[model samples]
Target: MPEIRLRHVVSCSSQDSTHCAENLLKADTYRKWRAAKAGEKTISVVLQLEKEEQIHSVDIGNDGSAFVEVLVGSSAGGAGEQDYEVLLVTSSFMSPSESRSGSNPNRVRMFGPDKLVRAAAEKRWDRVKIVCSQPYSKDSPFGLSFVRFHS
Candidate 1:
């Protein structure tokens, strides 16, 4: 496994600045990225990479999200550019029953190349978009505690 570092967070769909998206880059899982409001169906965070690199695996620490997806793209034109393609489709973080009960036994999940599409994994990207949702846990804000991408 190769070490992966988070460059910076470009943007986020929703966030509580105190628990900002940047928290996902921290080495401690105790820090977290949280949405501002409850019942948010979707929350996304775009991350800038140091350079174009191949992603071989990903590790995510779920805070309260029921599902999470990963996308790869580049902002070659400038800041306002978004040309993303799905690297990993919506994947379950918690089951409906688990989410409803607020049970998070498997808070951390690791995904290898087998979990990603061939084309997406084969290419190199300089940005990553992480989208999370907690439709099942609509009563509270949700997001990832931490995220890492390995080359």
Candidate 2:
């Protein structure tokens, strides 16, 4: 059996000052993405997991928004050969002057790596997509970006 690590299957956001935000807003639609009311910037990325390997854990990070939600589900819907689950979900919002400054030391949470594991795991879906949907920021240059899944 091949043992895979979190970094192998997990994707992340770019640590760019331009993408920093005071809060992580909710993005409801694909066409229009936004951040919090404070007018902050945001960066997002989607990761496609292995279909055969049971999702063991999810590590999420936040730069601004008070909180974040990891929407776990199939955009295509329905249980097919491979079943998908939301391994982990998290978010937070702290100011640059409050706790960690200039450092941009946001926060991260990791889910279980064994609890969700199963024998003869169901057929892993071909496309396990993860999208980052944040709210609109008053100081945002534009809305959020759409999540993407690459095989």
Candidate 3:
């Protein structure tokens, strides 16, 4: 009950026709959201939740990204980038050294409440936006594998 569902992927920066960002829901690491190709810069996806929730923590499994950031917002009263607030600042996903080597690229990291931005987490939100980047190399596609936000 704490895990968020109804993650309708309303918007995505860019995505491969094969690995659509829609795969973020239903919990799978193999089926992931990848960019059209390698070398693409920051890719972001917005998940519209079933209902507004107070996010307590977040779990994300990377797909070769170097850094990741999470944003939250409510679409009921307003719409636009201004409505979204940074829930978690850009955090490391894959280090340059690891992103270059292409070994052990997938890392599962969980951000606890203490790591979250207090002001954003304190309020309920209806959208979950994830922004990720892989800046070390452009040899392969990069995006996200899995995600979960607990109330």
Candidate 4:
């Protein structure tokens, strides 16, 4: 079995994940909000691993709503324009009571990593290409916080 390590933790300002009937459309909506504010920017994070080392999993934490995607082909220099798989998407919103609580809290979603690992181990392309989507919104006295890759 091959090892796994962090590969890329990119922050893209495209915010246009809404490409017709895709895996996560709503997540793309949140992306639009962020992209509008920051314009076009991409943080191409590269993770160096040993030879034959595969990617195990990735986690992101940021100061605003965000989504994670995996592109099969090479990037187009500008956030890339190849077929991408939505790994996970999440966000946070304000609460009614104007306080951060369980009623209005943060949320996260993770997919493809585990399944991809299993499938990859078993040599299943169809399953490895699977994607997942999740939405997050909350109300907190402190304010909203973004998502990014964390450990």
Candidate 5:
């Protein structure tokens, strides 16, 4: 799959001052975004794409979240959940066991067309809202380490 570029972050729900979402925009696995050390269980990041595309796949490197979901939308849409369509439903990243122990926190997985919502993935989208959660363990900060898209 040919990779697509993520322009920059549009907005975010919450994050530790240290692990902001901008780290993932660079696609560096070594650095990451975290909601907080021990506070929010779920946080979201709205990322604007370098260009609109019919997203066929997505690669995600988990930072600390147990589950991650992706939503697709356009710049013209209102900044509300309904304006964006779910491109990827809540999907497994880290197991509850691993989340609690913080093992395999950086696992990477690529979700192909079959894994993504056909309608959403087939249409061109200019922005994506990534929602991450770590309900298994509140002590560990949760978000994403790396993320990439394909058309």
Candidate 6:
């Protein structure tokens, strides 16, 4: 599958302006997007594609987050939770025990279309939202180091 070029950040729940949401678009894992606070229950970032495209898979490099979920929507005007479809559910990156001990290694995980059971893989969408959380690592600021959407 060809990787999709994500152009703009529609919005982000993270307040870490210094690290910034745009960092997630970078190809290098060294660069990252971090939430302002270490204990935030959830941090989300919304990305907009230049045009609608059928997404086949996704690769996400975890920084300190324990779980990550992916969602897709067709709306360019701005979408709410009800307007989006889950492309990937809360997949595990780190276990609670690992996170609490800060032993969770930074790792990249790939998810295929088959994992997105409720969503139609053939359907095209212009917007993608990524939600991450580290419920167990309250003392550690969490986010993703890198993310790539494939078509």
Model 3 misplacement above 4 A:
77-79, 137-139
Q: Candidate 3: global Cα-lDDT? A: 0.77
* Candidate 4 vs. true structure, TM-score: 0.30
**TM-score for each predicted model, relative to the true structure:** 0.87, 0.37, 0.88, 0.30, 0.86, 0.85
Instruction: For candidate 2, write residues 17-55 as lDDT tens digits.
Output: 333221122112322323323444344333334433444
Q: Residue 144 lDDT in model 6?
A: 81
Q: Tens-digit lDDT track for model 4 on 1-151?
A: 4323323223332232332112121333443122212321222222222232233453333322333333222232434433333333222222232222445334344333552334333231111121212233222111112222212
Over the stretch 98-144, how does candidate 5's per-residue lDDT look in tens digits?
A: 65575775687777898889978988888889888766555656677
Clashes of each: 0, 21, 0, 18, 0, 0
Error of 4 at 10 (Å): 7.1
Go through the candidates in order and give the C-alpha RMSD of each one to the true structure.
2.1, 10.0, 2.0, 11.1, 2.3, 2.3
lDDT of 1 at 147: 86
Tens digit of lDDT per residue, candidate 3, span 1-151?
A: 6766755776677577778778877675568778766785778888778889888888888777778898888876654745788889878867766765766777878888986888889798888788887565476776878777887
Q: Which of 2 and 3 is the better model by TM-score?
A: 3
Clashing pairs in 3: none
lDDT of each: 0.77, 0.34, 0.77, 0.28, 0.77, 0.75
Q: In model 6, state the lDDT of residue 141.
A: 72
Candidate 4 Cα outliers beyond 4 Å, as residue runs: 1-11, 14-33, 38-53, 61-72, 75-80, 83-102, 109-112, 115-151
RMSD of 3: 2.0
